[PDB]
Design a protein around this ligand. Structure first.
Ligand SMILES: [Mg+2]
Ligand SMILES: [Mg+2]
Ligand SMILES: [Mg+2]
Ligand SMILES: [Mg+2]
Ligand SMILES: [Mg+2]
Ligand SMILES: [Mg+2]
Ligand SMILES: [Mg+2]
Ligand SMILES: [Mg+2]
Ligand SMILES: [Mg+2]
Ligand SMILES: [Mg+2]
Ligand SMILES: [Mg+2]
Ligand SMILES: [Mg+2]
Ligand SMILES: [Mg+2]
Ligand SMILES: [Mg+2]
Ligand SMILES: [Mg+2]
Ligand SMILES: [Mg+2]
Ligand SMILES: [Mg+2]
Ligand SMILES: [Mg+2]
Ligand SMILES: [Mg+2]
Ligand SMILES: [Mg+2]
Ligand SMILES: [Mg+2]
Ligand SMILES: [Mg+2]
Ligand SMILES: [Mg+2]
Ligand SMILES: [Mg+2]
Ligand SMILES: [Mg+2]
Ligand SMILES: [Mg+2]
Ligand SMILES: [Mg+2]
Ligand SMILES: [Mg+2]
Ligand SMILES: [Mg+2]
Ligand SMILES: [Mg+2]
Ligand SMILES: [Mg+2]
Ligand SMILES: [Mg+2]
Ligand SMILES: [Mg+2]
Ligand SMILES: [Mg+2]
Ligand SMILES: [Mg+2]
Ligand SMILES: [Mg+2]
Ligand SMILES: [Mg+2]
Ligand SMILES: [Mg+2]
Ligand SMILES: [Mg+2]
Ligand SMILES: [Mg+2]
Ligand SMILES: [Mg+2]
Ligand SMILES: [Mg+2]
Ligand SMILES: [Mg+2]
Ligand SMILES: [Mg+2]
Ligand SMILES: [Mg+2]
Ligand SMILES: [Mg+2]
Lengths: 53, 98, 171, 108, 59, 71, 94
RNA sequence: ACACCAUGG
RNA sequence: AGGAGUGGAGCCUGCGGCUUAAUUUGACCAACACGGGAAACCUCACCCGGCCCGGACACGGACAGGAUUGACAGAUUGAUAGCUCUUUCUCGAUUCUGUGGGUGGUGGUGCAUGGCCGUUCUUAGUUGGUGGAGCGAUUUGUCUGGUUAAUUCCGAUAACGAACGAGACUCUGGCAUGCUAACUAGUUACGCGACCCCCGAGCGGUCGGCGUCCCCCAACUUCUUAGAGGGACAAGUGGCGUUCAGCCACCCGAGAUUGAGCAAUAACAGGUCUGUGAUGCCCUUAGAUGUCGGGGCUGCACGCGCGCUACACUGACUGGCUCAGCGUGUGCCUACCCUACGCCGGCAGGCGCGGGUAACCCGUUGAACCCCAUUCGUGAUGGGGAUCGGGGAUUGCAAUUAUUCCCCAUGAACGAGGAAUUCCCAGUAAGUGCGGGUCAUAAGCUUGCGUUGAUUAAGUCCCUGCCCUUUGUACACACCGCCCG
């Protein structure tokens, strides 16, 4: 059938995607969230982050 | 082929033994984890459960990249037929819950 | 876990678990009057006190739904079998939980009902239960191809400064 | 240009503009001189004048300024009158002249 | 822990930012005693959400 | 996001030639078998599987990427 | 050089079948980053542009350079006339 | 104790 | 009133135009270093070629001398895609053919929508009940006056009594020699001891001096850390105030005005379908708009925007000396972390062998400007460091259109910048470096942190705008209006 169904995706934007929306493009790697920048404002509370600065 | 008959039966028996299935939405990972892990790619698990759901037999949910599949009564019967079991055996779920 | 993760990553990972659990159980127990989770970890066991308005429907006849849910909650988060313990629970004064109200109003607006009648009803109910005031906004394509919005307010309300983080329940 | 009016839906004309040829009862013309009331004189590519009118779909939307290529529909029963169906970009105008569509008669 | 992001879903607007932060408190107590009493009393009197970890020896 | 262009080579699949099933064994006296083509002596192929004969090549059907012999 | 060796093979076996006092025809390839080696000399190569294969006869002076370095990916620009938006003054239509 | 200030898909 | 500027120069970068197979696309105060958008592959939506189905399910057909899958070699092919052809082995009811129907989509519509966010709008604004006035739309309450940062108060009073916004509130900065209490922070002492110098009495020990030298089962909490309380109230004193509400100066003081977060009613055809398994309708659906190889987003006659480095002597170069604060750190698929100390190499770098899941190790974070001493000398000069030649390493599957980095060499414009125009009030402007984000490699960006630290103001309504009252209007899509020959 096929032995050509992938080529190395082991670093850079091809490697990684958001644990919620499955998108690329603007995710937060800090502290190991791995979460899209829009998706994080959505759950920023249930994790425990509170805005008080 | 859609998958080997060996693979089908291995997936169905696991689903019946427990009564509920789970897989992440990903077609590339080479083995399903869990008790299919010695043999089966999770592409087969997804593709199998899809057919099973289109015939009743199963309820499907999806939340953050992960399917959750429950076996319903019609599923109990069909699987009990398809696997030739003692026509009254179910280790899936049997205890009165307080 | 041959060497443990650092305390920073540990607390982040706990919050992520508690977020994904709630968003999952939002989708199943929707029609069953769901109103949030509550976890509790004890030495060598993890209890999850689910919290809905009608436990008779979350449990199921002989409690099949509960075992199904415990099975997936384990199978997905990889708890060692025999470590998860899911209980049910009954909310007291169901008219004070904003989430239960939004869900019930939705399943009232979904079966076919004018908007004004449903909203009046939920306002009446969540003011009889005892609350210094409530507010309900419904927006979308109401009666035509151009969008609109309808506010129904009653009683008190606050919008600014720190007492908003208690004293106000939103959904 | 340049007004307060960001109220009308934005141009978005960047998507896939095709090319458009003649039909039965349609033909290209050039603009000679404009007149009031919206209607304008024209000159088709065989000789008729056809004092032409801007269709209701084009009112204050695509500006038919003087001396450019246009497409007009004829009337089944009257000939001295016509109506503007479309205006070409200078890109389409050269494309039609080269394609062997409009005659090597009139200039841009 | 500080996490600072643009407020806007898309790229339009004046350029406002959020400043999220989470705080972590940590303290230690030291005991000089046999193990059974301490692992007992430790095992009791914790209702709310708080993390407690007790080790073999630290002196 | 637009209309395609015409292809002039479309042919999805090979048509998978259909053959009458099994003449690879010859009964050659009453109750006596003859084998026209050997069974591939590859450890995993069970010696009940017939190796191919090409015009000058013997090739094993079940040894997907091995057992080709030059004669 | 894992399976870049097909370029090297097919480049030979084609400099061999070349009749004497002639040239080989065109091995043609997508492999734009190939180290030109002293064995590839004299050959005839077609290097993918992005749509065409452009032929390149190999000279000895091409040694140690890259293949893609001899087959450019675009037309050189020469300018038209500025359009209706070109200058901050240019915008106006009634 | 008053220079010049027109127009609007 | 002033400071630093921007516009002028070279370069970096975003937008238009031009060019092209394609240079994918959204947005035009409130677009243009914005889409967390630093694109080599991937990303990726664009362009040139090529395999796949991952087309559920139902009905019909076909079918165990058999439905159907895979594949060596030779040719073909960019390709070691059984992609197609020649060949002839394999697989065994999962498939294939035809119809109905489903599915996916960085396809279209932000002028069909949800949610979010921006903006009007940083100001003081907003609204209902019973009563009063009008046939009515409406109006008073919400105000002549003083006061306030404020629809904040005092008052007046056809209104009385209330709601929201303001304020209160939450975080942070400034003060405790008072409390709680600390080998994952210390200090003082001596138990010490040890090193070193006489450096001073003395001699060299003793008297002393230097110690991030080693100890203490010594004493304590000043420095460090972080919890509970305390403190500030226009409270005291003197003026101006209808003696009210409040303003001004001063005393005691750590401080008599620290900085943020949160924010109303009503709206906008503002932005986003390209964050979403949020989503209606339309489109395409096997010759794909659902995958691999190559190219593009970087293309350069030209117009603009946010910026970086400079035009030197209040400086450049070469040595020497001596000071921080916020932080991050081994990765759950994914597969990589911060680095000490030894050795090798001029340099980038290489090998070796320990610590760290972190107040424990990098680390007493030996940061730059600054500080001290040497050369140059008004000269496009040793200022400035563009452009270009040659060579050496690291990352990666791959570095050419040069990823980044190091060395020798080349040595452009630029001598304080026209019309215009931006930001700013005290630990502020500016100079100066250091962490976070993106990150295999990696800031001329942005988000934070400290470090040296000014000149000018304590105002006004002139300009550009904003809020309240009175007044005029032929406007209500509301002056970007309307309209005459
Ligand atoms: Mg309030
Ligand atoms: Mg406030
Ligand atoms: Mg004017
Ligand atoms: Mg005029
Ligand atoms: Mg006029
Ligand atoms: Mg400057
Ligand atoms: Mg650069
Ligand atoms: Mg462009
Ligand atoms: Mg536009
Ligand atoms: Mg503004
Ligand atoms: Mg984008
Ligand atoms: Mg690409
Ligand atoms: Mg769809
Ligand atoms: Mg989508
Ligand atoms: Mg809109
Ligand atoms: Mg909207
Ligand atoms: Mg009234
Ligand atoms: Mg009346
Ligand atoms: Mg009023
Ligand atoms: Mg005032
Ligand atoms: Mg009142
Ligand atoms: Mg304070
Ligand atoms: Mg402090
Ligand atoms: Mg010390
Ligand atoms: Mg306190
Ligand atoms: Mg007084
Ligand atoms: Mg004093
Ligand atoms: Mg303040
Ligand atoms: Mg507001
Ligand atoms: Mg959206
Ligand atoms: Mg849509
Ligand atoms: Mg793909
Ligand atoms: Mg590609
Ligand atoms: Mg670009
Ligand atoms: Mg900007
Ligand atoms: Mg790059
Ligand atoms: Mg920085
Ligand atoms: Mg890094
Ligand atoms: Mg960096
Ligand atoms: Mg950026
Ligand atoms: Mg005012
Ligand atoms: Mg009036
Ligand atoms: Mg009026
Ligand atoms: Mg009117
Ligand atoms: Mg008008
Ligand atoms: Mg006018």
């Amino acid at each position: 059938q096929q032995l050509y169904w992938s080529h190395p995706r082991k670093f850079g934007q091809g490697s990684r995607s958001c644990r919620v929306c499955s998108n690329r493009h603007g995710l937060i790697r800090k502290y190991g969230l791995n979460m899209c920048r829009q998706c994080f404002r959505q759950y920023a509370k249930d994790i425990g982050f509170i805005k008080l600065d | 082929m859609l998958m080997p008959k060996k693979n089908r039966i291995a997936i169905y028996e696991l689903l019946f033994k427990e009564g509920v299935m789970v897989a992440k939405k990903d077609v590339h990972m080479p083995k399903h984890p869990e008790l299919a892990d010695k043999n089966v790619p999770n592409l087969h698990v997804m593709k199998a459960m899809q057919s099973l759901k289109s015939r009743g037999y199963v309820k499907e949910q999806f939340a953050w990249r992960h399917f959750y599949w429950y076996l319903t009564n019609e599923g109990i019967q069909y699987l009990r037929d398809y696997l030739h079991l003692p026509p009254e055996i179910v280790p899936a779920t049997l205890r009165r819950s307080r | 876990m041959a060497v443990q993760i650092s305390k920073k990553r540990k607390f982040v990972a706990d919050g992520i678990f508690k977020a994904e659990l709630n968003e999952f159980l939002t989708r199943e127990l929707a029609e069953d009057g769901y109103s949030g989770v509550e976890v509790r970890v004890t030495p060598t066991r993890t209890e999850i006190i689910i919290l809905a308005t009608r436990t008779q429907n979350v449990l199921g006849e002989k409690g099949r739904r509960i075992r199904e849910l415990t099975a997936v909650v384990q199978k997905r988060f990889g708890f060692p079998e025999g470590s998860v313990e899911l209980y049910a629970e009954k909310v007291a004064t169901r008219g004070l939980c904003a989430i239960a109200q939004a869900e019930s109003l939705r399943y009232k607006l979904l079966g076919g009902l004018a908007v004004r009648r449903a909203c009046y009803g939920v306002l009446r109910f969540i003011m009889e239960s005892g609350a210094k005031g409530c507010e309900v906004v419904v927006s979308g394509k109401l009666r035509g191809q151009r969008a609109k919005s309808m506010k129904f307010v009653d009683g008190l309300m606050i919008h600014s400064g720190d007492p908003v983080n208690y004293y106000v329940d939103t959904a | 240009g340049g007004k307060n009016r960001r109220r009308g839906k934005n141009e978005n004309e960047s998507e896939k503009r095709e090319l458009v040829f003649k039909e039965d009862g349609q033909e290209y013309a050039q603009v000679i001189k404009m007149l009031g009331n919206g209607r304008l004189e024209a000159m088709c590519f065989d000789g008729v004048k056809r004092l032409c009118h801007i269709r209701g779909k084009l009112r204050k939307k695509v500006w038919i300024n003087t001396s450019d290529i246009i497409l007009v529909g004829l009337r089944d029963y009257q000939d001295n009158k016509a109506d503007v169906i479309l205006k070409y970009n200078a890109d389409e105008a050269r494309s039609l002249k080269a394609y062997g569509e409009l005659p090597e008669h009139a200039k841009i | 822990l500080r996490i600072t992001t643009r407020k806007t879903p898309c790229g339009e607007g004046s350029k406002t930012w959020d400043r999220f932060q989470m705080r972590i408190h940590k303290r230690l107590i030291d005991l000089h005693s046999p193990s059974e009493i301490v692992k007992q009393i430790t095992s009791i009197s914790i209702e709310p959400g708080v993390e407690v970890e007790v080790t073999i020896a630290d002196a | 996001k637009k209309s395609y262009t015409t292809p002039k080579k479309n042919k999805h699949k090979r048509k998978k030639v259909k053959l009458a099933v099994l003449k690879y064994y010859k009964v050659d006296e009453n109750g006596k078998i003859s084998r026209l083509r050997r069974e591939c002596p590859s450890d995993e192929c069970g010696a009940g599987v017939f190796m191919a004969s090409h015009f000058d090549r013997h090739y094993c059907g079940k040894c997907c990427l091995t057992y080709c012999f030059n004669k | 050089r894992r399976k870049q060796h097909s370029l090297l093979k097919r480049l030979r076996k084609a400099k061999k079948e070349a009749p004497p006092m002639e040239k080989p025809e065109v091995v043609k390839t997508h492999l734009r980053d190939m180290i030109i080696l002293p064995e590839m000399v004299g050959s005839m190569v077609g290097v993918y542009n992005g749509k065409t294969f452009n032929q390149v006869e190999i000279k000895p002076e091409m040694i140690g350079h890259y293949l893609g370095e001899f087959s450019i990916t675009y037309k050189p620009v020469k300018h038209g006339r500025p359009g209706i938006g070109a200058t901050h003054s240019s915008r106006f239509i009634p």
